[PDB]
Amino acid sequence: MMSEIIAVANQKGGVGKTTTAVNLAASLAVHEKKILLIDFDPQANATSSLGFRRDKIDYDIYHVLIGRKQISQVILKTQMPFLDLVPSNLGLAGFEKTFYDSQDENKRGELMLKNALESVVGLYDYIIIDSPPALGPLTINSLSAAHSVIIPIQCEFFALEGTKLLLNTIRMLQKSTNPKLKIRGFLPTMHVPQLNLTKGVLAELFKYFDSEFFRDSATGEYIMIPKSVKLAESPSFGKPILLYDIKSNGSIAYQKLAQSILQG
Amino acid sequence: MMSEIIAVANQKGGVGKTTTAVNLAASLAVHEKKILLIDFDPQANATSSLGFRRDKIDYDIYHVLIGRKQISQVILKTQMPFLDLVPSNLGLAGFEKTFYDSQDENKRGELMLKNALESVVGLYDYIIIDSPPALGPLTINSLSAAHSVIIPIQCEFFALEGTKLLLNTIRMLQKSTNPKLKIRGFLPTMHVPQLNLTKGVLAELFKYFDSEFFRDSATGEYIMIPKSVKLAESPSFGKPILLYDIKSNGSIAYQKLAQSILQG
Amino acid sequence: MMSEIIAVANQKGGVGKTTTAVNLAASLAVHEKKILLIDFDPQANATSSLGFRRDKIDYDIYHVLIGRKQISQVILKTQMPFLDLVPSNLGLAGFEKTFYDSQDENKRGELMLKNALESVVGLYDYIIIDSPPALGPLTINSLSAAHSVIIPIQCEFFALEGTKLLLNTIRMLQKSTNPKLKIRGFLPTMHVPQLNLTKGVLAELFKYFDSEFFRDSATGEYIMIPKSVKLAESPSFGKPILLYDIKSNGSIAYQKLAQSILQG
Amino acid sequence: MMSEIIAVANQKGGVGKTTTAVNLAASLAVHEKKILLIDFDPQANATSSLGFRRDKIDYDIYHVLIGRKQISQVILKTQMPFLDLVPSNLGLAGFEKTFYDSQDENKRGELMLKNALESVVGLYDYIIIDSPPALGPLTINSLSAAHSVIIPIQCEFFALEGTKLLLNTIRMLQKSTNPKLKIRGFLPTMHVPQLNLTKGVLAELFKYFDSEFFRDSATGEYIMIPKSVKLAESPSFGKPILLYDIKSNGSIAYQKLAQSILQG
DNA sequence: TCCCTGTTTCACGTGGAACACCCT
DNA sequence: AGGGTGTTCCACGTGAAACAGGGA
Numbered sequence A, B, C, D: 001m002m003s004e005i006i007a008v009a010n011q012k013g014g015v016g017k018t019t020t021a022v023n024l025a026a027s028l029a030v031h032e033k034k035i036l037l038i039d040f041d042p043q044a045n046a047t048s049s050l051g052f053r054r055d056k057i058d059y060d061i062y063h064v065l066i067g068r069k070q071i072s073q074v075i076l077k078t079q080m081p082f083l084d085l086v087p088s089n090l091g092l093a094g095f096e097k098t099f100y101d102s103q104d105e106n107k108r109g110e111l112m113l114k115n116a117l118e119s120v121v122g123l124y125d126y127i128i129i130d131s132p133p134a135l136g137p138l139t140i141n142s143l144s145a146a147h148s149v150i151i152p153i154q155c156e157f158f159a160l161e162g163t164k165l166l167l168n169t170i171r172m173l174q175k176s177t178n179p180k181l182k183i184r185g186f187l188p189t190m191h192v193p194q195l196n197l198t199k200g201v202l203a204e205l206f207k208y209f210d211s212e213f214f215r216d217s218a219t220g221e222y223i224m225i226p227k228s229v230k231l232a233e234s235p236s237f238g239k240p241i242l243l244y245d246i247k248s249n250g251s252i253a254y255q256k257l258a259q260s261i262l263q264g
Numbered sequence E: 001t002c003c004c005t006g007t008t009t010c011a012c013g014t015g016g017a018a019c020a021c022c023c024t
Numbered sequence F: 001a002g003g004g005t006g007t008t009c010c011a012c013g014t015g016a017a018a019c020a021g022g023g024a
């Protein structure tokens, strides 16, 4: 039993991290794999998108990072039996201060998530972490605990530099804390293929990263999440799109992403 | 005179903060008012949108907040003679550590931007600050230095929640540090009027906030930024839309926002 | 009393003449007024629509107009007690030859329906005549026997012309044979309001004829027959829509037409 | 050089005869065959559908049937070089009277169109005649002039009866005037395949006529003209949909009909 | 070089209709 | 059988964007 830990990360906000994390988790569960999703963002969209309103949540991931609880007590089960969730809440916005308090004394604070996870890394196939928007303490925790990193990219101008900064952050940690950190793939999100800016931004990214881009093993096609109002309406129903609408282009793209992850 | 300081702020990223700040700054410069735009985001998309490479940038606003420099030495003149810029760079990601130490030291980190701002408030008509996506120390400094706040809102499922969060921080600061802090307007961005999700999100926001939504004085119409790829392409040219294409509906909408701000 | 005689007439076929004639007859019969529907079409769709098999057809209207019989021996009772029928037959196609023999002679042939009708005009409240698709001798007899005229209109490219053609005939007969003949209304059929061609034809008709269009007295709304597959399947059951499905939109529209006529 | 004469005929109005005659003519001309289309309806919708309004026409088919002129002087050229038209006008409504005068004397009146046509039967590949709505003298001349007959069928209840009647008219003329008359095919028009009324009427027709229904040369699939608002807008442009939009489903169906006619 | 036009393609909202469950 | 639902499926209208060319 070993779980692969995959962080979905991008300092930039609004690029599809939470949409990807939730729907990739559900898409991997349908292939009868056991999935643990970790909302690592204080606003807690992944939690809300699975129907847990964060008025209702009592104990957070934050409580676990404090040692105030063990991760086994915070886990919640979802409408899908093979998808459980460690929820979030705005209390985790305290973690930033704790991080620096850690830096004050201890050479410790980068691995508060890795240590919180050790309890369960052997009871799931995949642990998917939904990261917040920055290269701050929460995202560094996220990347320091992960085997693999999924980078969802919206194909507009700021994605260019945005990636650069992100990758340098990974490679410093590849020499730092987490030498095993791997990029599992780039994933274009909200993808509108006919727009000129999209064609140019993807061309410029391909020039350096074509190797990194997610592909369909059967056909070798790129896998990209189309822009689809169905995927934006999904959180309004507390469900991932494969329960909410299984043949939408958005849902099909996320299930192809699951299979490609499933090759290796 | 005395500058009015407007923060462009929102709990979420990717909702058009940087787009609104840049294009509002430029649209007020056309009516020949003198404007300073402050990139207050470590990713620094505002800087990048006005054509400044971030490597070419030497000493940033971070230095100014740290006292290594004073705000007058970092200002740069732009392709618009009536629009200057305080550039940013990821070095400003250091500020949050400073922030917590400052609050540890003497409850001091929330007005370090306001103090850095005293040097120049009487040399501009408008100072526009573009803040990062969270309610973190940088955004807190932005809202604590400002007289008024523009909230750009993308009309998707979490907009209600996110704004509630932002408004509850604004209300803590009006009772704390900046009591005259005012809401200058909500501004719907990337607005696609035909989508059901858009109409539903706008109906729910109107029920609580119609009063705050920017309106064109002439006709009483709402001001909404249309979805317009020209606006996403403009920063790859280092220009604001009125220089890249002044007849775009995105450019027309931002000139209507500029005029509405100028009426009072 | 005197029965009011309404011709359902229009230069072109397939615009709904038979459907409105039949269902208007039934919808007025529900208000317990006694009505005779006169199939004046050799194809005899009204006959078949009330369940009469044309094997059972033995003595037609054609027999009556030649004097072979009087209108009272051809009438038949229908499943509605307040609705009887003069059936038709392809034998009625013989009448046009008779017509020209007639006009060769004595200006005789335009009123042969009117004369065959006065044997019974004091035994019904309404006489509804279902005319054939042209401005030929049968339709000429129909419009020459009638007090009022219903014009069903399918809203496609040639409707304008058709009505103009029909109108010119009506109005030559108003100075010729039947001077009190009046237009009781235009009635849009098979109406699907979303089509651009529907909108364009209705605008073109409104500009010349708005006054003539049937209206619901209660609200002043136009009465238009919706396109409704139920109304096309009803005659396969030998029924009018009010017996085949009373809550269909077709039946509701025809009952509002009935009510509007009952007002005068 | 022998021209094949094809009548487009059906007693019922509004079933697509003129739409079929026009678009079949145009679809055959594009296959480099020379086509003469004959408007045999006094309302003259085929003529107007090719852009010649009926105010503008000088001498019509009627003048020719009376012998007042010869068919070569009434012909008109179309926007397509391989399709000419003998136009119509409401003067042809006089022909019914002419027919019966003929009947008094000579057993002739059934072939006055056949007589008018011999003058040109050797200068066209196909002569397509667009018939009026009844089994009156005009349709009789049409079927007595033809080698073959195309029967367009709208699949509603009245197509059952109507069909039987038309065939008897043909079988009687196959014993009367035109012994080589053949039906080249049934053609379902305005076809909406999912409607239950459609499935049932086609089933009842297939039971007697499956062999007669038009089929695709290549696959043996039925050829049916889909219900398409583009085909109803087509006369609004004075053009057949082959020029007005050659990729609409209506246009594709008619060009498949042309190819199938062209196999034999 | 600018900028006018028309045409094509695409996602989304809309509503009539067949249908598989539903109640009972 | 009767009287909901809600679900899928289709054609059509709409509006943003790309584009081809047309234009002195």
Ligand SMILES: Nc1ncnc2c1ncn2[C@@H]1O[C@H](COP(=O)(O)OP(=O)(O)O)[C@@H](O)[C@H]1O
Residues within 6 Å of the ligand: A012, A013, A014, A015, A016, A017, A018, A019, A020, A045, A133, A189, A190, A191, A225, A226, A227, A228, A229, A231, A232, A233, A235, A250, B156, B157, B158
């Ligand atoms: N493929 C897509 N098409 C349309 N909208 C999307 C898509 N993916 C995400 N969204 C919407 O975009 C917004 C940002 O997505 P989210 O996953 O919350 O990004 P992040 O977690 O990176 O901040 C949300 O409104 C979300 O529902």
Ligand SMILES: Nc1ncnc2c1ncn2[C@@H]1O[C@H](COP(=O)(O)OP(=O)(O)O)[C@@H](O)[C@H]1O
Residues within 6 Å of the ligand: A013, A014, A156, A157, A158, B012, B013, B014, B015, B016, B017, B018, B019, B020, B045, B133, B189, B190, B191, B225, B226, B227, B228, B229, B231, B232, B233, B235, B250
């Ligand atoms: N009205 C608009 N239409 C189309 N794209 C837009 C619009 N406004 C912003 N964008 C694009 O959306 C992306 C995210 O917006 P940005 O302004 O950087 O917001 P934030 O500062 O909140 O992350 C950028 O690629 C930007 O060019």
Ligand SMILES: Nc1ncnc2c1ncn2[C@@H]1O[C@H](COP(=O)(O)OP(=O)(O)O)[C@@H](O)[C@H]1O
Residues within 6 Å of the ligand: C012, C013, C014, C015, C016, C017, C018, C019, C020, C045, C133, C189, C190, C191, C225, C226, C227, C228, C229, C230, C231, C232, C233, C235, C250, D013, D156, D157, D158
């Ligand atoms: N409102 C309607 N919706 C759907 N089908 C209709 C409607 N009105 C008529 N029909 C059908 O259209 C066909 C033509 O109508 P019909 O009443 O026979 O026309 P006409 O008598 O003018 O030739 C018939 O099959 C009829 O069932």
Ligand SMILES: Nc1ncnc2c1ncn2[C@@H]1O[C@H](COP(=O)(O)OP(=O)(O)O)[C@@H](O)[C@H]1O
Residues within 6 Å of the ligand: C156, C157, C158, D012, D013, D014, D015, D016, D017, D018, D019, D020, D045, D133, D189, D190, D191, D225, D226, D227, D228, D229, D231, D232, D233, D235, D250
């Ligand atoms: N396949 C089709 N889809 C939609 N409308 C059609 C179609 N065929 C014909 N129409 C329209 O139906 C009406 C009747 O067609 P038409 O060819 O005039 O029949 P007819 O010649 O038998 O009287 C016209 O408005 C016509 O444009």
Ligand SMILES: [Mg+2]
Residues within 6 Å of the ligand: A017, A018, A041, A045, A131, A132
């Ligand atoms: Mg998120």
Ligand SMILES: [Mg+2]
Residues within 6 Å of the ligand: B017, B018, B041, B045, B046, B130, B131, B132
């Ligand atoms: Mg920004």
Ligand SMILES: [Mg+2]
Residues within 6 Å of the ligand: C017, C018, C041, C045, C131, C132
């Ligand atoms: Mg009829």
Ligand SMILES: [Mg+2]
Residues within 6 Å of the ligand: D017, D018, D041, D045, D046, D131, D132
């Ligand atoms: Mg016709």
